[PDB]
């Protein structure tokens, strides 16, 4: 019943106020392991497992299942952990069973070309599907985001997101953004570990330092440079989150800035930038590097934070028109 009508992916015809893909009628926000799946809709309630992998579909996610394929051979001794193979046949004796030698998760996409080799639910990128989420559908300081298609955001808008469909535990995420205009000097970036419109990590880059023109609800000063922040809003999309996202630092009950480039180097107009992000939920590892061609423009260095155990990936925009995103790529890094 719940794991049938609750998920927006099973029935999109319902409300989902916090944009976490769980219908309002079922949403209770109880998530003890903070992996983005509430307790009663988590196949491993106490073990962090954001992608909810369950290869034998027995109700116990791989993360809390001792025999992920139910073939009687425990994971630790199974030479084909995700493919049933009782005889453990291994004709060349390399420790990998014949049953899964070319396609470990049996999603019909060989290991080498499979971006998520140990996840039957993901085999290729599908960033052809975006969920647009306005970060301030309350205030009207500026018009909300407008997206078109090269995914472009055309308005000097209020903050907003464009988030993908796939969910990840450990992941490497890369992409390209281009500001096709010399007008303005604000924000462009991306998100990862996205769970709800009140829960996600965000990486943003501003061109020139500037204080947000509306001192309400809180004073916000955004410095030029790359920043890494974690959002845990007590209010959700609105004016409070708005100013907090802009502020280079911490805003009570809204945002925490984990790192900011000490050099405050802003992005350049009409320049293609490539970002490379690595997130390892198990240890809380986070690192983002920005590139201008083959040149390194910014490097966050190792950052550690375990607020969120995983989630979706997406694009971020805040008061910057003509932001062109393209060539998005991602790969799972599990275990
Ligand atoms: Ca919801
Ligand atoms: Ca929720
Ligand atoms: Ca959970
Ligand atoms: Ca879990
Ligand atoms: Ca299972
Ligand atoms: Ca397991
Ligand atoms: Ca099992
Ligand atoms: Ca097994
Ligand atoms: Ca097996
Ligand atoms: Ca073998
Ligand atoms: Ca595969
Ligand atoms: Ca796969
Ligand atoms: Ca608005
Ligand atoms: Ca500019
Ligand atoms: Ca500006
Ligand atoms: Ca602006």
Curated annotation (Swiss-Prot):
User: Region (Disordered): which ranges?
Assistant: 9-104
Compartments where found: Secreted; Cell surface; Secreted, Extracellular space, Extracellular matrix; Endoplasmic reticulum
To which protein family does this belong? Belongs to the thrombospondin family.
**Principal localisation:** secreted
Entire protein: shown range: 831 to 1170 of 1170
Source organism of the structure: Homo sapiens (Human)
Q: Where is this motif: Cell attachment site?
A: 96-98
Q: Does the keyword Secreted apply?
A: yes
Expression by tissue: Expressed by platelets (at protein level). Expressed by monocyte-derived immature and mature dendritic cells (at protein level).
Q: What induces it?
A: Expression is induced by PGE2, S.aureus and lipopolysaccharide. Induced in arteries and lung parenchyma following injury or stress. Expression in vasculature, including arteries, increases in normal aging.
Subunit arrangement?
Answer: Homotrimer; disulfide-linked. Can bind to fibrinogen, fibronectin, laminin, type V collagen and integrins alpha-V/beta-1, alpha-V/beta-3 and alpha-IIb/beta-3. Binds heparin. Interacts (via the C-terminal domain) with CD47. Interacts (via the TSP type I repeats) with CD36; the interaction conveys an antiangiogenic effect. Interacts (via the TSP type I repeats) with HRG; the interaction blocks the antiangiogenic effect of THBS1 with CD36. Interacts with ATF6 (via lumenal domain).
Q: Start and end of every TSP C-terminal domain?
A: 128-335
Ranges of Basic and acidic residues composition bias in the record: 10-24, 53-64, 87-104
List the carbohydrate attachment sites: 232
The entry's function note states: Adhesive glycoprotein that mediates cell-to-cell and cell-to-matrix interactions. Multifunctional, involved in inflammation, angiogenesis, wound healing, reactive oxygen species (ROS) signaling, nitrous oxide (NO) signaling, apoptosis, senescence, aging, cellular self-renewal, stemness, and cardiovascular and metabolic homeostasis. Negatively modulates dendritic cell activation and cytokine release, as part of an autocrine feedback loop, contributing to the resolution of inflammation and immune homeostasis. Ligand for receptor CD47.
Q: What is this protein called?
A: Thrombospondin-1
Its GO biological process annotations read: apoptotic process; behavioral response to pain; cell adhesion; cell migration; cellular response to growth factor stimulus; cellular response to heat; cellular response to tumor necrosis factor; chronic inflammatory response
The residue ranges crossing the membrane are none
